[PDB]
Symmetry: C3
Subunit: 86 residues, 3 copies
């Protein structure tokens, strides 16, 4: 009962934790993309398949962004709902 609330609070906290981890990993991913681009641009050039790659990176980066936004909104909703619990 009170046991239930504490558990729920712990699970909601845990979702915040995991969201935070995925966010930091997204920044790591973008840092790796930067490094690869610095090498590809310098070593390879040249265009074409790398244009495919660039757009593919962009597409997936944007879906992660949208997912993280949706997850942020859901997190605040969940935290609000947790706080209204009897």
């Amino acid at each position: 009962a009170g046991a239930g609330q504490s558990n729920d609070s712990g699970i909601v906290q845990q979702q915040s934790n995991l969201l935070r981890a995925i966010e930091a990993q997204q920044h790591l991913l973008q840092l790796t993309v930067w490094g690869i681009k610095q090498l590809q641009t310098r070593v390879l050039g040249g265009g074409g398949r790398w244009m495919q790659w660039d757009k593919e990176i962009s597409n997936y980066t944007n879906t992660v962004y949208r997912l993280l936004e949706e997850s942020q909104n859901q997190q605040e909703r969940n935290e609000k709902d947790l706080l209204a619990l009897a």
Copy 2:
């Protein structure tokens, strides 16, 4: 009570969100591996430590895959169980 159900529904939705985010990040990871392979193959060759790297990438990619599969199954189970709630 009904408050509890809404919270639970929100937490389950949140797990789906995070699963989706991790899936998209996995695709980003594979895109970065592709780019690194394109450079390594071209610049470095050559074999050996990069064979270690390739198998290491494969091993970890496979555990993520298996984890995502297990997570998908768990998600459907959770969603089924949520729906059976009184």
Copy 3:
């Protein structure tokens, strides 16, 4: 009721699953950083912006680590709390 416990157990299991996935992806990330470093060191050298990059990678890697540690602790707490449920 018992329905509630099973759901909660499923959600806690699901958090463990996602934590595991993020952990494996972190190892993949470090493997990609290794490969990029092997190319940058060989092709580019040279220092400076790559020193920025190295510290940036380090900073974010450390926050993921700390987040994963915090998430591990939260997971054990949640699992303990789940087990004390009536």
